[PDB]
Amino acid sequence: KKHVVIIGGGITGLAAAFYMEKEIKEKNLPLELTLVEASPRVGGKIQTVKKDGYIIERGPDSFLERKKSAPQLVKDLGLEHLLVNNATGQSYVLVNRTLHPMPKSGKARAAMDFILPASKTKDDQSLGEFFRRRVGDEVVENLIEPLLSGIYAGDIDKLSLMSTFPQFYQFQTLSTGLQTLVEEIEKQLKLTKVYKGTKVTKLSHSGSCYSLELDNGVTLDADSVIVTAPHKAAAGMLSELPAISHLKNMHSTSVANVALGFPEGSVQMEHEGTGFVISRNSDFAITACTWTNKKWPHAAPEGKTLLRAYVGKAGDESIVDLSDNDIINIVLEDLKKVMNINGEPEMTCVTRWHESMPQYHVGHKQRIKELREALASAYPGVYMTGASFEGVGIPDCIDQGKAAVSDALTYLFS
Numbered sequence: 001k002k003h004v005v006i007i008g009g010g011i012t013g014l015a016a017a018f019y020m021e022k023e024i025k026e027k028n029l030p031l032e033l034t035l036v037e038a039s040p041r042v043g044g045k046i047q048t049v050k051k052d053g054y055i056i057e058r059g060p061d062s063f064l065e066r067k068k069s070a071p072q073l074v075k076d077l078g079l080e081h082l083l084v085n086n087a088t089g090q091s092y093v094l095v096n097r098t099l100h101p102m103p104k105s106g107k108a109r110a111a112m113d114f115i116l117p118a119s120k121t122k123d124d125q126s127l128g129e130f131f132r133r134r135v136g137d138e139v140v141e142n143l144i145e146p147l148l149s150g151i152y153a154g155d156i157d158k159l160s161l162m163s164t165f166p167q168f169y170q171f172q173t174l175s176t177g178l179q180t181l182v183e184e185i186e187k188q189l190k191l192t193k194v195y196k197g198t199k200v201t202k203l204s205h206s207g208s209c210y211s212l213e214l215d216n217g218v219t220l221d222a223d224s225v226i227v228t229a230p231h232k233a234a235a236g237m238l239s240e241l242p243a244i245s246h247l248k249n250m251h252s253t254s255v256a257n258v259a260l261g262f263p264e265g266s267v268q269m270e271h272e273g274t275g276f277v278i279s280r281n282s283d284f285a286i287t288a289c290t291w292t293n294k295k296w297p298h299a300a301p302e303g304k305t306l307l308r309a310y311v312g313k314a315g316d317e318s319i320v321d322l323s324d325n326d327i328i329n330i331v332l333e334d335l336k337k338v339m340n341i342n343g344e345p346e347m348t349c350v351t352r353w354h355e356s357m358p359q360y361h362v363g364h365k366q367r368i369k370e371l372r373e374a375l376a377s378a379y380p381g382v383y384m385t386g387a388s389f390e391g392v393g394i395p396d397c398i399d400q401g402k403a404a405v406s407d408a409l410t411y412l413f414s
C-alpha cells in the first residue's frame with residue numbers, strides 16, 4: 001500500500017487531496033494519502049470572515065467562471081446551490097483629478113487583434129515592453145498599467161508576457177463566502193490524514209522512500225510527494241537542488257485589503273459604478289476601490305454600503321506595516337477626495353498580505369521548466385505546483401493540483 005503526502009493545505013493541496021481520493025475510490029488503488037498544513041486552518045489565501053451580517057473576503061474575492069476547473073469542483077463538491085455571479089456595472093480609472101470611464105463583440109475581438117498584434121520574437125519579454133512597443137506610453141501608464149497592477153500587484157516592467165498572457169505568442173462566488181468551498185472539502189476528505197499546525201521543514205531520501213522532516217521532529221515516509229507551499233517555503237525543503245534557486249529568488253509583493261461598512265454616510269461620488277483603479281501619476285495611497293454591494297449585494301446587509309480598497313504596490317509597499325489606524329486613515333483620507341463620506345465607518349476590517357502576490361518575471365516559464373526537469377531526474381515522484389508556478393488564479397491552482405494528482409499516479413502505478 002503506497003503512501004503520498006501533500007504539503008500545503010491551501011486550494012492547491014485541497015484540490016489535489018480531493019481528486020486524489022476520488023481516484024483512490026474508482027480504481028481501488030492501494031494508496032494511502034496524507035496532507036500536512038502549517039497553520040491551524042486549511043484554505044490558505046482563501047479566508048472569509050463575517051461581522052454584523054457582513055461577508056468580507058479578506059483576500060480571494062471570486063473566480064473567473066470560464067475556467068471550468070473552478071465551477072466544476074463546486075459541482076463535485078455539491079454546492080451549485082450557492083453560485084452567484086457578479087452584478088455588472090461601469091468602472092472608471094482615476095487619472096489625476098478626474099474619473100474617466102473605460103471606452104465604449106466582433107468589433108472588440110478585432111480592435112484588440114489590430115491594437116495588440118501577436119509577439120514578433122519568441123523570447124520572453126515584459127508586459128511593459130510588449131505594450132509600449134505597439135501602443136503609446138500615455139496609454140500604458142494611464143490605462144493598461146493601472147489594470148494589470150490591480151490583478152498581479154506587480155511591476156509591469158518586470159512581469160513576464162509569456163507567463164501572464166501566453167496567448168500573445170463573468171465571475172462567480174459562493175453566497176456563503178468563498179471560504180465555505182474550502183471547509184466543504186475538508187469535511188468530504190475521508191482517506192486523507194489531515195495534519196494541521198505542522199510544517200514540513202525538509203524533504204530527503206531514506207532508502208526506497210522519501211523522508212519528510214517535520215516541525216515537531218516526527219519524520220513521515222512517502223513514495224510520492226506533492227508540494228504546494230509558496231515559493232519561499234518550498235525552496236527551503238530542497239535548498240540543495242541547484243534549480244531550486246529559481247524558486248527562492250522569486251518575489252511576492254505585499255499588499256493590503258481594507259473593507260469598510262457605511263450606514264449611508266456614503267453619499268455616492270459624481271458617477272456611480274462598480275469601482276475604479278488609480279493611475280500611476282496620481283500620487284494616491286490606495287490602488288483601487290470597489291463597491292462590494294453593487295457587485296455582490298449578498299455581501300452587505302441592505303441599507304448598508306460595503307466598500308473595498310486596496311493598498312500597496314510593487315516598489316513602495318511599506319504602507320502594509322502601519323497600524324490599522326494609519327491604514328484606515330490613509331484610505332479615507334484618499335477615499336474622501338472623490339466622494340463625500342459623511343460620518344465614520346460603522347464596520348472596519350483591515351488585513352495584510354506580506355508576500356502573497358507571486359511575481360512571474362521574464363523567463364519565468366523557462367526557469368520553472370528547468371526546475372520541473374531537475375526534479376524529474378533527481379527527485380522522481382516529487383512534484384511542486386501552486387500559485388508560484390503556472391497561474392495564481394484559483395481555477396489555475398485547482399488544475400495545477402489536478403495535474404499533480406495525475407503525475408503522482410502515473411509515477412506510482414501506470
Ligand SMILES: Cc1cc2nc3c(=O)[nH]c(=O)nc-3n(C[C@H](O)[C@H](O)[C@H](O)COP(=O)(O)OP(=O)(O)OC[C@H]3O[C@@H](n4cnc5c(N)ncnc54)[C@H](O)[C@@H]3O)c2cc1C
Nearest residue numbers: 008010011012038044045059060061199200386387392394
Ligand atoms: C489578498 C489576496 C486576494 C486574492 N484575491 C483573489 C481573487 O479575487 N481571485 C482569484 O482567483 N485569486 C485571488 N487570490 C489568489 C488565490 O487566493 C491564490 O492563487 C490561491 O489561494 C493559492 O492557493 P495555493 O493552495 O496554491 O496556496 P496557499 O493558499 O498559499 O496555501 C499554501 C499552504 O501551504 C501551507 N504551508 C506553508 N509552509 C508549510 C510547511 N512547511 N508545512 C506545511 N504547510 C505549509 C500554508 O500555511 C498554506 O495554507 C488572492 C490572494 C491574496 C493573498
Ligand SMILES: O=C(O)c1cc(Oc2ccc(C(F)(F)F)cc2Cl)ccc1[N+](=O)[O-]
Nearest residue numbers: 063064067150151152153357392393394395
Ligand atoms: O492577483 C490575483 O491573484 C488576482 C487574480 C484574479 O483573476 C483574474 C483577473 C483578471 C482576469 C482578466 F483580466 F482576464 F479579466 C482573469 C482572472 Cl482569472 C482576480 C483578482 C486578483 N486580485 O489579486 O485581486
